[PDB]
Design a protein around this ligand. Sequence first.
Ligand code: NA
Ligand code: NA
Ligand code: NA
Ligand code: NA
Lengths: 34, 126
Amino acid sequence: RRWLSKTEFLSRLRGAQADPGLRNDLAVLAGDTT
Amino acid sequence: PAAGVLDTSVFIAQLDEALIPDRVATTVVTLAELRVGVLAAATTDIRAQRLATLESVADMETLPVDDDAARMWARLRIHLAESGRRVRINDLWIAAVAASRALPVITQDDDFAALDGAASVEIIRV
Ligand code: NA
Ligand code: NA
Ligand code: NA
Ligand code: NA
């Protein structure tokens, strides 16, 4: 575990983004507001 | 800025790459949220995708909620209560962690907007 460079992060993330539907699941599971 | 803290929305499906700081970390809140994503996935394809998303943070600094973040959360929470504005509680934990380290929150979504101008808060929308 270390601080990733911009390029490193974007390399790890590209092709690995969650489906848009995760927003929906997270609204149900962790959408509780202040 | 030199460094920033990714929220959960940046991991979810292009981003404005120019605005991402040179060095990035995330927090334990996003670790939790990506993990619940894997466990909630309805079909193998979605599960495999979300599992890749979870794995993308394996090497990345995951910042904890420590004492300093806790103190910040209280300040930010009362700021919101007084103004009558709202933030998802888990997003407030993210903002508390980032603010307590004097780092900006990097976000793709619109939740952190309510905190603009609070001390130590800087929001970067990508
Ligand atoms: Na986070
Ligand atoms: Na699942
Ligand atoms: Na992981
Ligand atoms: Na901040």
